[PDB]
Amino acid sequence: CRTSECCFQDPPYPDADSGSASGPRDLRCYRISSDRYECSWQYEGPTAGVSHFLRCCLSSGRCCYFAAGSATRLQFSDQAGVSVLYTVTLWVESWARNQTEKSPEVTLQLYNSVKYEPPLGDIKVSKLAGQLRMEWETPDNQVGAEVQFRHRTPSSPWKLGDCGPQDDDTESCLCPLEMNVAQEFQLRRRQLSWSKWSSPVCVPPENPPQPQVRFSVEQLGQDGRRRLTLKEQPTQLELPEGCQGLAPGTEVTYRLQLHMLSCPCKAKATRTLHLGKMPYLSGAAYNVAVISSNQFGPGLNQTWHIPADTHTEPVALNISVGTNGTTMYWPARAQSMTYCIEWQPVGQDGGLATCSLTAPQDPDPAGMATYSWSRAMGQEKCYYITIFASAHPEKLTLWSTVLSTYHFGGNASAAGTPHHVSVKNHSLDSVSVDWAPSLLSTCPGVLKEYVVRCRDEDSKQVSEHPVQPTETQVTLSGLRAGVAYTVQVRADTAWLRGVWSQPQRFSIEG
Amino acid sequence: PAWTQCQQLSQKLCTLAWSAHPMDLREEGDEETTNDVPHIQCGDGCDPQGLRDNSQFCLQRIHQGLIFYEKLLGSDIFTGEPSLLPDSPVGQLHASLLGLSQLLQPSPSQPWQRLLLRFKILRSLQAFVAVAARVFAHGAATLS
Amino acid sequence: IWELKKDVYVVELDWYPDAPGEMVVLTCDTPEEDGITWTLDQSSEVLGSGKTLTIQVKEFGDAGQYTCHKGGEVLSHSLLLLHKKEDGIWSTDILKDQKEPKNKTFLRCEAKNYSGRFTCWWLTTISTDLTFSVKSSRGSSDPQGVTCGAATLSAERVRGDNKEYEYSVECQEDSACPAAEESLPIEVMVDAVHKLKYENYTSSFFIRDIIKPDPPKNLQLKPLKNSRQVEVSWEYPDTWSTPHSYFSLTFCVQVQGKKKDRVFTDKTSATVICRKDASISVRAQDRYYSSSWSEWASVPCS
Amino acid sequence: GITNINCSGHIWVEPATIFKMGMNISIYCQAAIKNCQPRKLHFYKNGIKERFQITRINKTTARLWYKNFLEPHASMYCTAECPKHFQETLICGKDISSGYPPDIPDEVTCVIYEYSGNMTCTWNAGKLTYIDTKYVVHVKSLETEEEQQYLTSSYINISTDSLQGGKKYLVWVQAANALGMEESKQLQIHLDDIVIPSAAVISRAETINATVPKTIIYWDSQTTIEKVSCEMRYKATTNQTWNVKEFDTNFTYVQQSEFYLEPNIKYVFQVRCQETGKRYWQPWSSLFFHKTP
Ligand SMILES: *[C@@H]1O[C@H](CO)[C@@H](O[C@@H]2O[C@H](CO)[C@@H](O[C@@H]3O[C@H](CO)[C@@H](O)[C@H](O[C@H]4O[C@H](CO)[C@@H](O)[C@H](O)[C@@H]4O)[C@@H]3O)[C@H](O)[C@H]2NC(C)=O)[C@H](O)[C@H]1NC(C)=O
Ligand SMILES: *[C@@H]1O[C@H](CO)[C@@H](O[C@@H]2O[C@H](CO)[C@@H](O)[C@H](O)[C@H]2NC(C)=O)[C@H](O)[C@H]1NC(C)=O
Ligand SMILES: *[C@@H]1O[C@H](CO)[C@@H](O)[C@H](O)[C@H]1NC(C)=O
Ligand SMILES: *[C@@H]1O[C@H](CO)[C@@H](O)[C@H](O)[C@H]1NC(C)=O
Secondary structure (H helix, E strand, C coil): CCCCCCECCCCCCCCCCCCCCCCEEEEEEEECCCCEEEEEEEECCCCCCEEEEEEEECCCCCEEEEEEECCCEEEEEHHHCCCCCCCEEEEEEEEECCEEECCCCEEECCCCCCCCCCCCCCEEEEEECCEEEEEEECCCCCCCEEEEEEEECCCCCCEEEEEEEECCCECCEEECCCCCCCEEEEEEEEECCCCCCCCCEEECCCCCCCCCCEEEECCCCCCCEEEEEEEECCCCCCCCCCCCCCCHHHCCEEEEEEEECCCCCCCCCEEEEECCCCCEEECCCEEEEEEEEECCEECCCEEEEECCCCCCCCCCCEEEECCCEEEEEEECCCCCEEEEEEEEECCCCCCCCEEEEEEEECCCCCCEEEEEEECCCCCCEEEEEEEEEECCCCCHHHCEEEEEEEEEECCHHHHCCCEEEEEEEEECCEEEEEEECCHHHHCCCCEEEEEEEEEECCCCCEEEEEECCCCCEEEEECCCCCCEEEEEEEEEECCCCCCCCCCEEEECCC | CCHHHHHHHHHHHHHHHHHHCCCCCECCCCCCCCCCCCCCCCCCCCCHHHHHHCHHHHHHHHHHHHHHHHHHHCCHHHHCCCCCCCCCHHHHHHHHHHHHHHHHCCCCCCCCHHHHHHHHHHHHHHHHHHHHHHHHHHHHHHCC | CEEEECCEEEEEEECCCCCCCEEEEEECCCCCCCCCEEEECCCCCCCCECCEEEEEECCCCCCCEEEEEECCEEEEEEEEEEEEEECCEECCCCEECCCCCCCCCCCEEEECCCCCEEEEEEEECCCCCEECCEEEEECCCCCCCEEECCCEEEEEEEECCEEEEEEEEEEEECCCCCCCCCCCCEEEEECCEECCEECCEEEEECHHHCECCCCCEEEEEEECCCCCEEEEEEECCCCCCCCCCCCCEEEEEEEEECCCCCECCCCCEEEEECCCCEEEEEEEEECCCCCCCCCCEEEECC | CCCCCCCCEEEEEECCCEEECCCCEEEEEEECCCCCCCCEEEEEECCECCCCCEECCCCCEEEEEECCCCCCEEEEEEEEECCCCCCEEEEEEEEEEEECCCCCCCCCEEEEECCCCEEEEECCCCCCCCCCCEEEEEEEECCCCCEEEEEECCCEEEEHHHCCCCCEEEEEEEEECCCCEEECCCEEEECCCCEECCCEEEEEEEEECCCCCEEEEEEEECCCCCCEEEEEEEEECCCCCCEEEEEEECCCCCEEEEEECCCCCEEEEEEEEEECCCCCCCCCCCCEEEECC
């Protein structure tokens, strides 16, 4: 009559007298939903032109049948006429090669034969009160089930346990948790037939492993940058045989956190990146931290410190000290460049660099960039100065070093005057001129050379000779005995001639 | 009335009342609210035609509702324990309500009942402050 | 046993195994008294005789269209729709559970504007012999007038091994006042009938609670010359109520492409920046009562 | 109702609404909704649904069981889901407080203060009871057997001129709350012995440059008691030890006292006194800091 309605008429084939061994067997009927039932059987022998039929007979004695065709199972709803609140008798009749083969009868109440299904893969996992807790939504129309679990580690077999009664919209199961090895967990249910074991649940360790990684940094290029590179990758976590390659949600996530130690006067100096995206760094100092995390949270992090570059470059840095403040001038690299200037007093072990940030600047008519501050670099002292710049100041990975050099603050001409200058008779025609190294010698690259002046007081003749910046002793020869002489020494810089020391008057006695 | 200030402060009132109570429980026996809570019904002249005809009828009802809701927000339901934070938005609600009522026209309960009472009062307050802010919004663009 | 409609009766049942069912008496609607015969559905076998009929309703096999005859002619009809009661909980087999925003949400109703028109959608996987019947009213102590039309089919979709059918119905409030403050809610009462199984559902709401305005209309973009900054221009949705200075809408604008842009403008225009192959997407919400957001209507950045 | 909450049942907790802190409690909600069987009960705690650990014993009543209940106060109400209604239906609620029974009070002392017309009494409280606890002070005479009872949340004073039933009295305190009550030991007092004089204050301090540097400390007390003994603590600011000396002082004039202290060291000074022979002493006076030249 219909695909889902029992026909209360005779089957269009005679009854089974053959009794062949091959045929339908194992007829079981379960209730899958609130108003849908299914019946499944197995057929023995070849399936060459075999039509199966499901037969039912109610309490009143009237018998009906379904036209299952060649399928091995059938579904119907409670309005098909098959009684669901009472006792029915179901048996399978199969027609093949012009013969009939019946099946053993099964007598049951269809509303009671319910088979419960394990959880449908969507199981939540969590850590509560020192024990692992997993929760799954209840399958539809399958409330009230005894639930039983089994678990194993990579080094242990299955262990059986119980979670307790389950009578809610969502279930739960309290399980022990391992510290460093992962676990596999499989789950099954039975109503207050036991269900088949679930798909595997895999659980990662509560504390993620420390990131076992190694880094390398390139030498500072002429563009002012150097790239960071990963030398060693993190070691893979040991997973049980049933969890290997299974459960992507149990994977450990690694994140790289960069902290620029230079330019501390900036608004933000930290940025988080993926370990697969290696960044470019300037000649500044940086701290690099790697953080491991999983579904339970972050683990122990490892941090590496990258030191600042110490190379000194001879760049035309002009510093002018005015009545209202000090101004710095240096060659600009490109248009719309934001500059960060750092200076450290020489000899101050562990002293923090003073940071100054400029607005975006374009090269001036002389091709120079400028920065001014109020009265500040202390006077008569040497400073190590490093300048960084970026066209995209918000991107820490785009900052580059402009210059790195030493500079003497204040009046270098006056403060650089050679001290403790002494003249001693060496021979009847020569003298020794010895002096203490000027303050400029403590500033690498600032002291260009010394100059010695000798004046004969009787003839008024003056002679000047240049001396290397590393020499503080010279012997002057070719002098006349009994004559008065005057000597002075000065220290010259890359841009200014120094002030002459106090004139020392002497004469050769012997 | 001062339509622009009233409109902007009623906007403040709407956003505060929706910040206070961003959930549901049904009390049996409730079939006759009647005169317990004044409401703006149809026929109080708060539709645009009612505003363009005569605003006094609508503003009278709005002021009565406002003073009722200040009396509710100032009783032991919102001052008694569990005591709310003065920095919590609830305290701001009473100040804004007092402001609106000023610019317009110059039973004891157990500690467990007060959560439910606060929720039901905020639920009614949002529904009333919506139409109040609407009628003040329409005035400041037509009846200027 | 009670009456649902003319010549249709609903029998309640306690649905547990080996139930005793209920006792049911049937009476033919005729002034005659003798020579009365009865049949069930299309079968011609006589079940009983006389003006009255007594049956014991135990299962769907005992329910169906009962007919009384006299002289070989059909006198009247009496249909029996069962109503399963499972341990005090009635059945919800017919209408599929949407489970949003909470469980057991069977009817989902929405309104585009404030004028008093709503529309309820409900989902089922049952294709044939299905017959709905919707009635509605405002309040229950002293109901007012709300009229609902016939329930038709809107769209059909396939999900999983089964199908899925979506129905809808348009209802209008008779004495609608778009500006008032609602005090007592609306009731919707659906009578789902499928062959011989009767079910019946209910939903209650405030009109201000179920408002979802239309996607914003007439989206046009004009960026600044040689600049990625684009100002967004649109108009209020057509179906929204009027005047727009009373029923005000606060908007939302995002920029999505393949870095999150979120702005809420109470004015009909705003300016953002489009990346390469991005889309400007716009929403809407009633400004004063946060009912619900609107679906995105978008055009792409080029 | 916007001003009232209607209960639709009842709720009680075992053992009681008030109980000892940290015990195991059981909350039984019995829904009494008319024309409805409760689909699901749904307990709440301060508006937060505690979903875990519920047992549906039977259709009307479900049980929620707590382990180690550590809140001083919590609002608990139980709700229900009716099959036809959409919102949860409230059944009823209760408020529960947890604390401790009171400890035994000790260290009972009482003093008359000079000119005050009062006796002040104090006693220790013990562990925190976390609930409303009340103290009852009993003052019984040894001579006329008359007892006077008094009430405080903390401490109290008794006026001197109410103790006319002789001079030998007996005082003890009683601590009371809902979870227990304990009594203190009985303290014996006599009004002559318990008098403490008026507070002594240091005025100034100067050091005299002599052959040995002498530092004099200047102080007075406004008492009228003829016989008074005192004690004073002096120490360097860098030292932790105290140095105390005894005096017999008559406060008709400002008493003077010399000290031999190390130069260029800042010292600190404090004083306490008592009626000679009496049990109680004054508290140490406020800290006076002085630095030798
Ligand atoms: C949704 O479904 C529920 C469950 O089926 C349904 O509740 C039932 O409603 C009917 C009709 O409202 C109730 O039957 C009534 O019961 C009262 C109480 O005794 C009687 O007085 C009524 O008698 C009248 O009607 C009879 C038959 O028409 C007449 O013979 C009589 O003379 C009276 O005129 C009537 O029997 C029934 O009790 C409830 N069920 C329960 C469990 O309460 C509800 O009505 C449905 N709602 C919608 C909107 O579809
Ligand atoms: C016992 O007497 C003392 C002395 O008068 C009271 O202490 C004073 O109390 C008042 C009122 O609170 C305060 O304004 C004073 O500052 C307190 N003085 C001191 C020195 O503390 C004390 O309160 C009395 N006890 C009781 C229970 O009232
Ligand atoms: C249901 O449970 C409560 C509490 O356990 C009990 O007092 C009662 O007798 C039970 N039965 C009924 C019908 O309430
Ligand atoms: C005596 O005690 C009472 C309270 O107990 C207090 O009000 C009064 O001030 C006290 N007397 C003096 C002198 O402090």
